[PDB]
Amino acid sequence: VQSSVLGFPRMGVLRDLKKANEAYWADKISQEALLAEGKRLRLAHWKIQKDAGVDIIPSNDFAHYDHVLDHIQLFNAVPERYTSQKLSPLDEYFAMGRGHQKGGVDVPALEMVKWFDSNYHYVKPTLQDNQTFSLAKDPKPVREFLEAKEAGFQTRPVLVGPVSFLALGKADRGSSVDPITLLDKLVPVYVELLKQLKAAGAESVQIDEPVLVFDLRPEVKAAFKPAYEAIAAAGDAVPKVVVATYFGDIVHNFDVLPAFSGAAGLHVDLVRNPEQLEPVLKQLGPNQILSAGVVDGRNIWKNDFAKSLEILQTAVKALGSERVIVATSSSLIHTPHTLASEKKLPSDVYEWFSFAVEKVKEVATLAKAVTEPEAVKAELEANAAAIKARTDSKRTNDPAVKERQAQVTPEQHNRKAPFNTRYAEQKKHLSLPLFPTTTIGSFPQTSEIRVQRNKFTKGEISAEEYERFIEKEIELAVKIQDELDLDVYVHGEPERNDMVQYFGERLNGYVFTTHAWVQSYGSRCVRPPIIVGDISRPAPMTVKESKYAASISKKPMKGMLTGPVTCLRWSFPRVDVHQSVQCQQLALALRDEVVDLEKNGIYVIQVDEPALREGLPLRKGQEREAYLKWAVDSFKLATAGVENSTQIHSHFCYSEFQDFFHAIAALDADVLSIENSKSDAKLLKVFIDEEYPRHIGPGVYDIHSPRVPTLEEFKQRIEEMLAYLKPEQLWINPDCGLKTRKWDEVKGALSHMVEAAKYFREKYANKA
Ligand SMILES: [Zn+2]
Secondary structure: OEEEOOOOOOOOOOOHHHHHHHHHHOOOOOHHHHHHHHHHHHHHHHHHHHHHOOOEEEEOOOOOOOHHHHHHHHOOOOOHHHHOOOOOHHHHHHHHHHOEEEOOEEEOOOOEEEOOOOOOEEEOOEEOOOOOOOOOOOOHHHHHHHHHHHOOOOEEEEEEOHHHHHHOOEEOOOOOOOHHHHHHHHHHHHHHHHHHHHHHOOOEEEEEOHHHHOOOOHHHHOOHHHHHHHHHHOHHHOOEEEEEOOOOOOHHHOOOHHHHOOOOEEEEEOOOOHHHHHHHHOOOOOOOEEEEEEEOOOOOEOOOHHHHHHHHHHHHHHHOHHHEEEEEOOOHHHOOOOHHHOOOOOHHHHOOEOOHHHHHHHHHHHHHHHHOHHHHHHHHHHHHHHHHHHHHOHHHOOHHHHHHHHHOOHHHHOOOOOHHHHHHHHHHHHOOOOOOEEOOOEOOOOHHHHHHHHHHHOOOOOHHHHHHHHHHHHHHHHHHHHHHOOOEEOOEOOOOOOOOHHHHOOOEEEEOOOOOOEEEEOOEEEOOOEEEEEEEOOOOOOHHHHHHHHHOOOOOEEEEEEOHHHHHHOOEOOOOOOHHHHHHHHHHHHHHHHHHHHOOOOOEEEEEOOOOOOOOOOOOOHHHHHHHHHHHHHHHHHHOOOOOOOEEEEEEOOOOOOOOHHHHHHOOOOEEEEOOOOOOHHHHHHHHHOOOOOEEEEOOOOOOOOOOOOHHHHHHHHHHHOOOOOHHHEOEOOOOOOOOOOHHHHHHHHHHHHHHHHHHHHHOOOOO
């Protein structure tokens, strides 16, 4: 039985790729140096995989910035504004990713959005009405395939398929084309590429059609037939094709599968959806290979070999060993490079982890174990012992947490009274005028804020010295808010680096790494916390700063928390228990924090859930509904312990809520802030259609621009929102936190914002 890896993380052991890209963008190294570093990394990673024993090794998975972006260039789908700049291929590539300035003209980047339900971001194919396609000179997949071959590595090239390419695309400015209608123009180019790959020596190709996990509109469904007939019709002139899917099941799209009857194999994610195995087996053509995705490409836990082998033997029994491939569930770009780089983890947790280097070995070990378990019996025994150790650990058997969870009731999820009763108490308590003004949370993160934070964590300044600095920063924020005449204050979060790490460090059940970076957005990476055990709160987490802030504040002061869904989803979660169990533990820990804030002079508490929408299962049905039920219940459990006179606020970083506005409404938040300033006011129609009965602050100030909007601009924006929202429900606030802005920009913009609010207060004042 063969082993397979769908993709390897690109950044390198020490984020070598990030260092090189950025050094190139800062003119410290030449194009030749950067490309050579790219080559060095690809070679090092191919070697890791071959040394591990991997039979089917990927190529074309590497990217300097983004693989979808690679495909845009590969198919000459580049808009005029980039090609007219007459740049080198590399500089044109980066121009689409980051932006570029040739001459007096400043060329912005293409839109980047999240890749399915991951934290990875891809560049959307951005297409013209008159779009045609052709294969780029020196096509990347062929180039990298031959490079691998020359260095002794036979590889399997990875393409994003034609249907997904367009499905994930959009019409450019000045165009209205529905991208999928360009299929007939694109398919020939894939056929030409596959012919070149085959002539270069590629025996098979991995073609990702990840949109198969979506609910597909009929136009997209109908695209698979012509696209894959064209590929099959090329016969032996193209490589064998394995169609790949991940991050969800495909059992709702069995009507699409006949399009792949001329393909050699199908890859399914059996980590996310193990239950899809046997229904999928029944849908395979008589000679088709199952690529069984059994090693998790999305998390950092050692594989359960015995569990994986049971799954694999089911496949082997049904199909025969020659029709089964042991594979990673998805690409490993979503995992860190290697566990060996971690020198400060607790000794007991090491044996539970596998990062990318460890995972590529795992597929080889499993593949060997399918037919010859004796050859790896010592490794199989070690694996079983690791899983047993995790099961038996004190970390995963906290009796107090278990007991607390067992006693949770439905009623504890609900506020003491509905909004219509609550609001009267809130109104007088907070003493809010019409059009109350506030901000979202963070204030400018200055050089000295970062410097002082670093010195404290390194131990170069004492706890007492740091706390005094934090006091002074909070005093400053409050002094500025006093001068601005804002109605509800924040403390600025000068003590906080990252909205999930800050909480992870102050909860039981978490561990932190030093080197476990994952590519997120071009060359920006994240280093997620890891949940290893049952979660609880040993001490107040944010009370000290909020308590001090309230002690000097003439206005209501916002408590500031990250919700249980985000504390969960923006970490690597456990796999030994269901995510709902983990989220509930977090919800109870945060419930305690909320109550502690309220006991310390805080009566406006903002709980933000930016991972909420991201966690949505990728298709509609019982799994999506199950997620929303526990995600919503977790937020409610965390926030429902407050008095009626306390306000619960929540900020959302989007302007559209397709599908899940019902979930937002089920949160029962008193006040909602949303991003809106750069969007058309017509998006606020959802609040009318859903008859939203509670309070709303659609952002009126674009915080991602250093420009100070004028008084008249703020007034015009407020007027536009009032076309959709009732005066009594309207809050006046920025689009988001202010960490990325400077204080001069903040003072100017917020001064104008408050003045605009005051103007409307007079316009809407009672007549004589
Ligand atoms: Zn936001």
